[PDB]
Write an enzyme that holds these catalytic residues in place. Structure first.
Site, PDB file in Angstrom:
ATOM      1  N   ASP A  27       0.863  -1.176   0.000  1.00  0.00           N
ATOM      2  CA  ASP A  27       0.000   0.000   0.000  1.00  0.00           C
ATOM      3  C   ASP A  27       0.901   1.229   0.000  1.00  0.00           C
ATOM      4  O   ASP A  27       1.740   1.394   0.891  1.00  0.00           O
ATOM      5  CB  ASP A  27      -0.937  -0.010   1.206  1.00  0.00           C
ATOM      6  CG  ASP A  27      -1.966   1.111   1.166  1.00  0.00           C
ATOM      7  OD1 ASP A  27      -1.842   2.025   0.324  1.00  0.00           O
ATOM      8  OD2 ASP A  27      -2.909   1.073   1.984  1.00  0.00           O
TER       9      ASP A  27
ATOM     10  N   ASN B 226       2.588   5.666 -10.655  1.00  0.00           N
ATOM     11  CA  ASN B 226       1.237   5.780 -11.184  1.00  0.00           C
ATOM     12  C   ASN B 226       0.192   5.635 -10.083  1.00  0.00           C
ATOM     13  O   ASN B 226      -0.924   6.147 -10.215  1.00  0.00           O
ATOM     14  CB  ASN B 226       1.029   4.718 -12.269  1.00  0.00           C
ATOM     15  CG  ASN B 226      -0.272   4.890 -13.039  1.00  0.00           C
ATOM     16  OD1 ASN B 226      -0.580   4.138 -13.961  1.00  0.00           O
ATOM     17  ND2 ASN B 226      -1.050   5.885 -12.643  1.00  0.00           N
TER      18      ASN B 226
ATOM     19  N   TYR C 217      -7.272  16.223  -5.114  1.00  0.00           N
ATOM     20  CA  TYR C 217      -6.677  15.611  -6.295  1.00  0.00           C
ATOM     21  C   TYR C 217      -5.960  16.655  -7.142  1.00  0.00           C
ATOM     22  O   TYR C 217      -4.837  16.433  -7.606  1.00  0.00           O
ATOM     23  CB  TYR C 217      -7.758  14.896  -7.108  1.00  0.00           C
ATOM     24  CG  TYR C 217      -7.235  13.921  -8.138  1.00  0.00           C
ATOM     25  CD1 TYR C 217      -6.792  12.659  -7.765  1.00  0.00           C
ATOM     26  CD2 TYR C 217      -7.200  14.253  -9.485  1.00  0.00           C
ATOM     27  CE1 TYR C 217      -6.317  11.761  -8.701  1.00  0.00           C
ATOM     28  CE2 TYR C 217      -6.729  13.362 -10.429  1.00  0.00           C
ATOM     29  CZ  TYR C 217      -6.289  12.117 -10.032  1.00  0.00           C
ATOM     30  OH  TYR C 217      -5.819  11.227 -10.968  1.00  0.00           O
TER      31      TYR C 217
ATOM     32  N   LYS D 108      -1.984  16.896  -7.814  1.00  0.00           N
ATOM     33  CA  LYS D 108      -1.544  16.877  -9.203  1.00  0.00           C
ATOM     34  C   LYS D 108      -0.581  18.023  -9.494  1.00  0.00           C
ATOM     35  O   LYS D 108       0.494  17.814 -10.078  1.00  0.00           O
ATOM     36  CB  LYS D 108      -2.775  16.962 -10.096  1.00  0.00           C
ATOM     37  CG  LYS D 108      -2.545  16.768 -11.560  1.00  0.00           C
ATOM     38  CD  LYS D 108      -3.856  16.985 -12.272  1.00  0.00           C
ATOM     39  CE  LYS D 108      -4.835  15.873 -11.954  1.00  0.00           C
ATOM     40  NZ  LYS D 108      -6.139  16.064 -12.645  1.00  0.00           N
TER      41      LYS D 108
END
Lengths: 609, 304, 152
Positions: free
Chosen positions: A29, A56, A127, A131
């Protein structure tokens, strides 16, 4: 299964010994540093030195609005999407620099922004900020990791895949996203109406919520004592509602009541936990299927209309283009987009031209309650407190600090106003929400607020010698502390003020001068680029959810050290310009002038000083 | 300029181009086979701006200001009123292409025409000579604002799959489009730059909610094309130590949803254009013209 | 010379009848519309429908200050770098939309700018403005030329 299919294809295509070409590490994890270390040591034992690092692993996140965002979820998604990137890069870089070559590639997405142009992505701020952190990390480590190591990021657009899988860019079950969208819109309208009522009505939060207990929209509509906001909300629920759905006749349900109570409690408003226990339950269906179908088609049609080519690329095409890109050797620090041509509003950043605010906005500053937060920037906070109190008639100012030493220093630098009762001090530490809560409870709710970072910028090296052990290089714990102090603190303050009826909130990036080192400049650029996306997302989100609050960003950081002052005159000029910029981004707009267009302009903008 | 201190050869770029051309889901993007360059940038897209400094406003009093345009009759009327009536301008000259436009602008502001403050010259396609007469028989300019002459055509950009594309925008009409919307601004900019102007405001073509999709496309084309020219000329003027401040004021928005829908927002956009051009045309006093302030105030384009 | 070396490489790498795989249409100056039409008709007669249009032809420009740039040089730079792109796009689009497939690739330059971020490039305003115009043409015609024809 994936390893079996890969090795089957490898055996089919003529390769030899497929068993030594693919290995698996289940149970790793990415959210735990120890598991990352186990992965590193296991891959080193298996295949030796590693050349390519394709990071990724990334989750959608909390999938909730910022004012609905728990802190622990924000921390978890920050560790998962951003921190682990530098964790793996730190663990692997010495070996690649030893062998004289290396490549790391972060799998980003389109929906977070670009150079000098941010992209909002509502309900998904974590997110987007993670990013932007990935892109900033690649962009700033390109120079240092050279020439031995290349760094790049790939940001594909919407790519067709499983409806149950993906990082939230694509649907997916339109039904579930549709119903959550309508529930969120109902909650947002109700909360905004309640906040608007509490802003000007003398009734406390308890009495205002008491009007909502019968769960009768009609009783609210023709209630003469009901606030104009709630009566208008009832009229809108009649106009846009469906008589076949109980929601056009019932205000809310148990889930909406619980979420509203959570919002009210986290906003500093006092309400009993059992206030919503006796709410009548609207009969099913609360929402008719026609509405959910309609706005699900609306969302799907918007997503499709984003596409110029009217079709979504598949995963295989993106992977094929990625491997084709990996053959290029003379690129480092760029963002690759295997897919594009997308319809979305952008919020360009890097603005440096500005003047003075309108006098009408300046008059709004008189008699307001203003909070300032910071530890390191004593001179700037002193100048700002002087500017608000002495020049524009501010009533009271609260200095919120992390430690007792900072409070003492700030008190001594402005003893004259402390003894006059116009500059007061609170200590926050890592419970900044508690400091805001006591400030609101014992002095009242804020107006405009400016936030600055507590801790300074560390000067530890980011790159070491090739024949070294990288002992003194920036460690993973140091990076976690960095993102906690410079990114998590702003998120916490912004959430707390947003739930606390602020008038405006100005975020300050760490300051840079010609005296700072190269590493400090790189870290400041990282923080600024990362925070740009968060500011744009929260501004657009607040604009969409009909919030009064104007949230903006002011930059004390400049990309090059040649852009920094070299004489005291330029330093005081930058100080005055910072004062003017905060004045622009903090001066409240009159409610008459708060139109759609003006509200759209004055949210999500960032100005570089 | 390079991070890697190595310039890739043509073969590498060709390799990357051939590899990228095999992608079947990309169109309208900007692909860079190489990068990592340390070069100064001038970001565009600014929209949050206010009133300029009163000291700069006082500089406008007693100056010589020229306005140029054909299609923006209402805009030119409003701006001429703003400079003459509100900030003490002695005279304004309207440089036009057609006798009809000169007559129209004369009729709209006949009160100023009879007062000798609004005076018209005809330029046609020799606008350099028109500006030359204007300077010769009125004196050298101060701040000047230039707007496009011709409107945007509505010829199709793409026809049906089984259509002959006879009515689609052809090479010639694109040539006049480039001449009117790009070469005109270059000519006016060069003429003023060599004529000792104080400031130069370039106006992009205007679009409203009534504009067609092709008009939006050509407007975006002109905006993106002119951004680079304005930025380069501003930076060049800053390095060549010229007094002139060359800036861009933008009347277009990228999508229909961004444009106003009611007359109230329309007059708001009118006054916002006025304040933006006041920002980009108010002369800075020579004492305040420092390195940093001069760097900020040149090559910037803002959106109304 | 380039054609001879290319066909030598093709013959070496195993291809057959290299003379029918690489043709030349030299003497076509990009600055003339008539020469562009001649190039289009030559390519159509030689190979029929053309799928890929690689517009790379572009000169440095006037190579002067904006304040030292004659207008004729400005027009020549625009014709060579900007107008010719739309001319060739217009002439080659009908076939590509007739057959349902096509690709035009225009060679831009980093020193011309980017979306929401411009780049100064002194002595060379014409090159930068034309290059950004090429980029804008691609980014704006992507919508209308699709989905049959790609532009980049």
């Amino acid at each position: 299964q994936m390893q079996a299919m890969i090795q089957s294809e490898l055996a089919e295509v003529g390769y030899t010994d497929v068993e030594d070409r693919v290995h698996i590490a289940p149970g790793c994890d990415v959210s735990s540093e120890a598991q990352l270390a186990d992965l590193v040591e296991r891959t080193l034992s298996a295949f030796g030195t590693v050349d390519y690092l394709i990071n990724n692993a990334g989750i959608a996140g909390v999938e909730e609005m910022v004012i609905d965002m728990p802190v622990e979820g924000w921390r978890h998604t920050l560790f998962a999407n951003l921190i682990s990137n530098y964790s793996l890069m730190r663990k692997l870089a010495p070996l690649m620099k030893k062998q004289g070559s290396g490549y790391i590639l972060n799998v980003s997405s389109y929906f977070g922004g670009e150079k000098d142009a941010a992209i909002p992505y509502p309900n998904r701020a974590d997110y987007a900020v993670s990013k932007a952190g990935q892109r900033a990390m690649a962009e700033v480590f390109a120079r240092f990791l050279g020439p031995e190591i290349q760094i790049n990021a790939i940001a594909p657009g919407p790519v067709e895949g499983d409806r149950l899988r993906g990082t939230g860019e694509r649907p997916g079950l339109f039904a579930r996203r549709a119903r959550l969208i309508l529930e969120n819109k109902r909650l947002n309208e109700l909360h905004a109406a309640l906040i608007a009522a509490a802003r000007t009505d003398e009734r406390s939060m308890h009495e205002l919520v008491e009007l909502l207990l019968p769960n009768d929209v009609a009783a609210l509509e023709q209630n003469p004592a009901a606030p104009t906001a709630l009566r208008e909300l009832a009229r809108r629920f009649r106009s846009e509602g469906d008589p076949a759905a109980s929601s056009s006749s019932a205000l809310l349900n148990r889930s909406i009541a619980a979420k509203l109570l959570a919002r009210l409690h986290n906003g500093g408003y006092v309400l009993p936990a059992d206030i919503f226990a006796n709410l009548p339950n609207p009969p099913d269906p609360f929402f008719t299927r026609a509405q959910i179908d309609r706005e699900a088609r609306k969302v799907r049609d918007g997503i499709m209309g984003m596409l110029y080519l009217q079709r979504m690329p598949t995963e295989f095409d993106v992977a094929m283009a990625t491997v084709y890109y990996l053959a290029d050797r003379n690129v480092s620090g760029e963002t690759f987009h295997p897919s594009g041509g997308l319809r979305y509003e952008r919020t360009p950043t890097g603005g440096e031209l500005f003047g003075l605010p309108s006098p009408e906005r300046l008059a709004e500053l008189v008699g307001s309650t203003v909070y300032l937060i910071g530890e390191h920037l004593t001179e700037h906070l002193n100048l700002l407190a002087r500017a608000y109190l002495e020049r524009y008639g501010a009533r009271q100012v609260v200095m919120i600090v992390e430690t007792e030493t900072g409070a003492e220093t700030m008190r001594r630098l402005l003893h004259d106003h402390v003894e006059a009762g116009r500059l007061m001090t609170i200590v926050a530490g890592d419970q900044i929400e508690a400091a805001i809560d006591q400030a609101i409870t014992r002095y009242g709710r804020p107006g405009p607020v400016v936030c600055t970072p507590f801790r300074p910028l560390p000067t530890v090296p980011l790159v070491g010698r090739k024949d070294s052990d990288w002992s003194t290089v920036l460690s993973e714990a140091e990076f976690a502390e960095l993102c906690e102090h410079q990114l998590t603190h702003h998120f916490r303050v912004a959430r707390k003020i947003a739930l606390s009826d602020g008038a405006s909130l100005a975020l300050v990036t760490p300051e840079t001068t010609a005296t700072s080192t190269t590493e400090q400049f790189a870290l400041a650029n990282f923080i600024k680029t990362t925070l740009h996306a968060f500011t744009a997302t929260i501004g657009v989100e607040s604009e969409r959810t009909a919030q009064r609050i104007l949230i903006n960003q002011v930059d004390l950081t400049r990309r090059a050290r040649a852009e920094e002052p070299r004489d005291p005159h330029e330093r005081q000029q930058e100080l005055e310009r910072f004062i003017e910029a905060v004045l622009l981004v903090t001066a409240p707009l009159p409610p008459e002038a708060d139109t759609r267009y003006a509200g759209r302009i004055h949210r999500g903008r960032a100005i570089t000083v």
